[PDB]
Amino acid sequence: KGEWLPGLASPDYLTGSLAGDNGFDPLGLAEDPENLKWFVQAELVNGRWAMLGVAGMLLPEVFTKIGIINVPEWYDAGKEQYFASSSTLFVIEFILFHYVEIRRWQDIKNPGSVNQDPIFKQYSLPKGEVGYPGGIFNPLNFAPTQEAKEKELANGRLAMLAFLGFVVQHNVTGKGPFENLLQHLSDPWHNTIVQT
Amino acid sequence: DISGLTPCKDSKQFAKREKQQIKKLESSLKLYAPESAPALALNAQIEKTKRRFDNYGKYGLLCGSDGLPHLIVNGDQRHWGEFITPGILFLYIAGWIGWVGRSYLIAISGEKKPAMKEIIIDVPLASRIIFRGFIWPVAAYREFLNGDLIAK
Amino acid sequence: HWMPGEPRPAYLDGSAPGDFGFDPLGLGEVPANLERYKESELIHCRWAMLAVPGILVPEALGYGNWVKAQEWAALPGGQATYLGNPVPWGTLPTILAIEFLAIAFVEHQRSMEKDPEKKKYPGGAFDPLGYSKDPKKLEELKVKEIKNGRLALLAFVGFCVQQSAYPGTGPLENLATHLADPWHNNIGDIVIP
Amino acid sequence: MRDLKTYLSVAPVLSTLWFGSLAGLLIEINRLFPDALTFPF
Ligand SMILES: CC(/C=C/C=C(C)/C=C/[C@@]12O[C@]1(C)C[C@@H](O)CC2(C)C)=C\C=C\C=C(C)\C=C\C=C(C)\C=C\[C@@]12O[C@]1(C)C[C@@H](O)CC2(C)C
């Protein structure tokens, strides 16, 4: 579709049949079709996780302007005491995520092989694409048209860049992502990466 | 105290070495007028020596009985900056260089006279290939999985 | 299948009892090697399905855990005990001699067999109640035996490993410790100190 | 000149330029951060 850089030609292997195809591959990673098949799923999962991560790192700090709750910052949330030890929670998380991610992985190898429930055999996911399971994962039956997929990919890429910015700013400034915005909005020409 | 060693900051022999070096540097300065350039150079040398000794004291090195720092390479987390991190950086750089060389060699293998492209380098193609080695681990690992790394 | 969506090895057709295609390393490729492995698996399962009752029952009667029963033999002059009653012949060189002779005879007797089927399910006199009379029931029984044996082997591995993390403790003691405070007395602390 | 550009791509001249730039970079790096025995970061 669109060109990431006018005046340059698109790669041959990027034919525009994929969602969010702007012909961006200067370093040629996806020349091998198997690499492309793996990297599509990698991008999807990374974007979907980063969107939730950013949403959870930003909004629980926006409370200061509205003053509903009192929650520690995203980099101090770990040290707080909880009803269970950190090791127990980590063990349970590992136990569940092992099964979940092994179930997801088998679809990439042999599509359509894990669409059936293992305990209640009368239940099965409708046939779909590799990275878009559907079924009970889509309770509202929204149509997965190409426009919605492109919107999803754009939001995922933006959120990934936002998470990288959130990580890098804290190492330098030492404050929260929202506090960095208000300081910039106070004196825009004096509060940038160039401190002076 | 690994292997019976002692921290540099508590070592008396380390301080004695510093004092001897500084005293040796100071005896040469008495031969020159304070305003002269050699006096300025000797002052800079003395300041640099003091700074080097202070920095070695700060980083948590270990000294022996001779007052000289020793390196621990067994993998202990308290000394990862001595061997592990520079090793990983060197491995990354060497893999970059090797991958770029292999890519350039493969690129010109299909030409009519591949030998002439080795004594007279094709600058634009190499420049285009130079940037690609920045992600060499991913490309090498995926090539290994696909079986294209080893010649048949 | 041990993992749905995974191809099976060609030599694991799904007709053997307790066959689910589990062979990631391909150790059963050689037909002569795979035939031996079934006998060894059955022997291991049958030996481990007797140990599990023999580890929990003495501990459930307050006679001490399964590693305390072996402490006395390291001492000079230690004498064996059974149900709290010392046995007259419980000296170390009397026990070692009678164990080697009794076992070396039966295992060598099993070794000399040359019919592959009788090395796994010998039948005959060792089946006094005649449960093998029905070939239809027999297949279900073999599946049940194989499914229980692997569980017993896993239980014995748990027995062995739990001892290392909690020296001097019995499995029932570990269960009692876990039951009181489940959310802090578990595996997590051992893995992450 | 095409021939002049060809002579600049020969192996010895290119190697000399590359190694000169490399040595300059290393000298400046060791000038800014002298006496590095450990990676402290
Ligand atoms: C998933 C993700 C982050 C997820 C974060 C999560 C969940 C965070 C959770 C937490 O916060 C909460 C919620 C609770 C907080 O208290 C605590 C934690 C737990 C911390 C990031 C991905 C992040 C991914 C990123 C940044 C990727 C960047 C990649 C780029 C730029 C690639 C560029 C190229 O790829 C192309 C386009 C083509 C190549 O040819 C050319 C190049 C140039 C090479």
Query: Which residues in chain D are closer than 8 Å to B122, comparing Cβ atoms?
Result: 9
What are the φ and ψ backbone dihedral angles of C86, each rounded to 5 degrees? -60, 140
Indicate if the alpha-carbon torsion angle D29, D33, D36, D41 is positive or negative: negative
What's the number of CA atoms in the CB half-sphere (13 Å) around residue A70?
A: 0
Q: How far is CA B136 from CA A180, B145, C61, in A?
A: 35, 14, 64
Contact C170, C63 (CB under 8 A): no
Q: How far is CA A41 from CA A29, A132, A193, B140, in A?
A: 14, 10, 35, 20
| A92 touches ligand 1 (CB under 6 Å) | no
Query: Quick one: which of C77, C96, C67, C71 has its CA closest to C159?
Result: C67
C56 has binding-site annotation? no
Q: How far is CA D5 from CA B99, B127, C126, D14, D22, in A?
A: 27, 15, 94, 11, 22
The residue with tokens 């001897």 is B20
What are the φ and ψ backbone dihedral angles of C152, each rounded to 5 degrees? -65, -40
For this experimental structure, what is the resolution in angstroms? 2.8
A151 has binding-site annotation? yes
Going from the Cα of C193 to the center of ligand 1, the distance in angstroms, rounded, reads: 30
Gap between the Cα atoms of B56 and A178, Å rounded: 40
What are the φ and ψ backbone dihedral angles of A142, each rounded to 5 degrees? -65, 135
Instruction: Report which DSSP code applies to B10.
Output: G
Query: Quick one: which of C171, C137, C158 has its CA closest to C65?
Result: C171
Contact B15, B23 (CB under 8 A): no
User: Distance (Å) from the C-alpha of residue A28 to the closest C-alpha of chain B?
Assistant: 8
Mutate to test the interface with A, among C3, C186, C187, C190 (most CBs of A within 10 A): C186
What are the φ and ψ backbone dihedral angles of B76, each rounded to 5 degrees? -65, 140
Look up residue B15 and give its amino acid. Answer: A
Structure tokens at A77: 């949330």
Q: How many angstroms from the chain centroid is the CA of residue A160?
A: 6
Contact D2, B123 (CB under 8 A): no
Structure tokens at C150: 């692997």
Question: Number of A:C CB contacts under 8 A?
Answer: 34
Gap between the Cα atoms of B94 and B136, Å rounded: 10
Strands, E, within B34-82: which ranges?
62-63, 69-70
Nearest C-alpha in D relative to B50 = D35
DSSP assignment of chain A equals ---SSTTSPPPTT--S-STT-----TT-GGGSHHHHHHHHHHHHHHHHHHHHHHHHHHHHHHHHHH-------TTTTTTS--SS-HHHHHHHHHHHHHHHHHHHHHHHHSTTSS-B-SSSTT-BPPP--SS---GGG-TT-----HHHHHHHHHHHHHHHHHHHHHHHHHHHH-S-HHHHHHHHHHSTTTSSSS--
Q: How many residues does chain D have?
A: 41
Query: Quick one: which of A191, A190, A189, A171 has its CA closest to A181?
Result: A191
What's the number of CA atoms in the CB half-sphere (13 Å) around residue A112?
A: 4
The residue with tokens 């305990």 is A119
DSSP assignment of chain C equals --STTPPPPTT--S-STT-----TT-TT-SHHHHHHHHHHHHHHHHHHHHHHHHHHHHHHTTS--TTGGGSGGGSTT---EETTEE-TT--HHHHHHHHHHHHHHHHHHHHT---TTTTT---GGG-TT-GGG-HHHHHHHHHHHHHHHHHHHHHHHHHHHHHHHSTT--HHHHHHHHHH-TTTSSSHHHH--
Look up residue C107 and give its amino acid. Answer: E
Gap between the Cα atoms of B129 and B107, Å rounded: 9
Q: How far is CA A127 from CA A48, A122, A133, in A?
A: 21, 15, 8
Please state the domain extents for chain C: 15-64+70-184
B111: left (phi over 0), alpha (psi -120 to 50) or beta: beta
Name the CA radius of gyration of chain B, rounded. Answer: 26
- Cβ–Cβ of A106/C188 closer than 8 Å? no
